[PDB]
Amino acid sequence: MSRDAPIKADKDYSQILKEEFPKIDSLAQNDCNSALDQLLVLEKKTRQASDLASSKEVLAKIVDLLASRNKWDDLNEQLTLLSKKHGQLKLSIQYMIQKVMEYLKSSKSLDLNTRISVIETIRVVTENKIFVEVERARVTKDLVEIKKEEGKIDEAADILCELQVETYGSMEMSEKIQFILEQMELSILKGDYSQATVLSRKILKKTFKNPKYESLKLEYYNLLVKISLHKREYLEVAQYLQEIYQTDAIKSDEAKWKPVLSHIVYFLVLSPYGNLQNDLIHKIQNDNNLKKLESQESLVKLFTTNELMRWPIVQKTYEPVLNEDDLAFGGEANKHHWEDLQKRVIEHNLRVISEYYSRITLLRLNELLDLTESQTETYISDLVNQGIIYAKVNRPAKIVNFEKPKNSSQLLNEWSHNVDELLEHIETIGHLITKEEIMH
């Protein structure tokens, strides 16, 4: 409020209490409660100005209460009581409540006391959506930090995550992101990747465009890669790394853009081959930055050219090179992702063979693929289901025909085209004979 009766008169009276500040201090020792009463008695006003000056005294006392690793119990009831009475307004206290919090971080008190006093603050403010909301969150992440380290991580994870669904208040946009990224983090360790997806679609790519959140964007994208790796979505890992790449800062600096680009190659080759794969792999072929690299240049350029190549050797070839690097390939866990590269090689070979070979014997196709009869046939089946190729197989070991099923329509429509093209040619020839008369 703005009540004019306790401006100066009361200010002057608190200064008179400042002079009595040693008398209160000496009282505390004889009885903590008498020193306390006096300062509680001073505060009843609802004049904001004098509220902050009086509460400042009460706050100095709480320094002593918190310092003492036993008095601090009393502090729990008092904050609770100050809430309980009426308060003095929705503006007033709620600044002071923060100086309550400020002190806790720096005391470096016994874990036990800290914990109790902290659960009592979130208790006091729980429901409330005035200023306090922001602060509730500031302290809740701290209660989490303690339980995080313990074996109580599961309990920690569920509380943290629960809170932030609703906190969307006065809070600056930067801080919202921060909390959210933290939430994703505990959910990696818990191992429900499905949970983490729900959380992630909260933050928006519109936000990140603002340069204020630059550093935030890198951690955010870094995390998104992780989510996708667990569920073996290889293309989806590629799309997210490509967004980082385009962050200008990293881009221009040599040493920092280097690893990023390497990663992208690995995952782009592992993606299910398809229309997305294709348009994306000629962007990497075009990429100038790629040709300065030579270890990765030599890998992409192989798979783009249609000249087939047998697995046993390509394995060998890039093993002492790329298995060295991390993500996708790398150590021991990483080898159970490396494996997939095999599969990639043969569905590229088959793919080339459908185009060039219209007819091929089945025994020969096995020889080329370097696989026994039973695996070869499994794989052909898998490709037609996926629609990559058209196939007709014969098991008594006759022929496998990739040729287009030759329909009525195809013969006629192609013939239709041809004829217009002819007519078009004759005309063109005609313009140019005119030209040659002038020349000659």
Partner 1 sequence: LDLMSGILHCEDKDYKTAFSYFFESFESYHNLTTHNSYEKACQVLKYMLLSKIMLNLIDDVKNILNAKYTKETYQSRGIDAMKAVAEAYNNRSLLDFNTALKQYEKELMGDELTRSHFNALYDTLLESNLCKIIEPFECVEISHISKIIGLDTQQVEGKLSQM
Counting every residue, how long is the chain?
440
* Residue 108 or 406 having the CB closest to partner 1: 406
Cβ burial, residue 360 (10 Å; 0-12/13-18/19+)? middle
Q: Which is nearer to partner 1, 211 or 396 (CB)?
A: 396
46 vs 401, beta carbon nearer partner 1: 401
CB of 404 to partner 1, least distance (A): 15
The 3-state secondary structure of 194-249 reads HHHHHHHCCCCHHHHCCHHHHHHHHHHHHHHHHHHHHCCCHHHHHHHHHHHHCCHH
Nearest approach in angstroms of CB 155 to partner 1 is: 15
Residue 190 C-beta: closest distance to partner 1, Å: 11
Q: String of b and e for 298-320 (b: at least 16 CB within 10 Å)?
A: ebbebbeeeebeebeebeeebee
Residue 373 CB, nearest approach to partner 1 (Å): 11
In angstroms, what is the minimal distance from the CB of 347 to partner 1?
15
Task: Give 60 or 384: the residue with its C-beta nearer to partner 1.
Answer: 384
Choice between 293 and 391, CB closer to partner 1: 391
Residues forming contacts to partner 1 in the complex (CB under 8 A) are: 192, 194-195, 380-381, 384, 391-396, 398
Q: In whole angstroms, what is the distance from residue 198 CA to residue 251 CA? A: 31
CA distances from residue 191 to 184, 197, 219 in whole angstroms, order as listed: 11, 12, 19
The smaller minimum CB distance to partner 1, of residues 28 and 393, is found at: 393
* Least gap, CB of 291 to partner 1 (angstroms): 41
Helical pair 93-107 and 111-125, crossing angle rounded to 10 deg = 160
Contact 136/126 with Cβ under 8 angstroms?
yes
The two three-digit tokens of residue 137, written as one number:
């969150």
Q: Among 215, 216, 223, 214, which Cα is nearest to 241's? A: 223
Supply the minimum distance, in Å, between the C-beta of residue 118 and partner 1: 28
**20 or 192, CB closer to partner 1?**
192
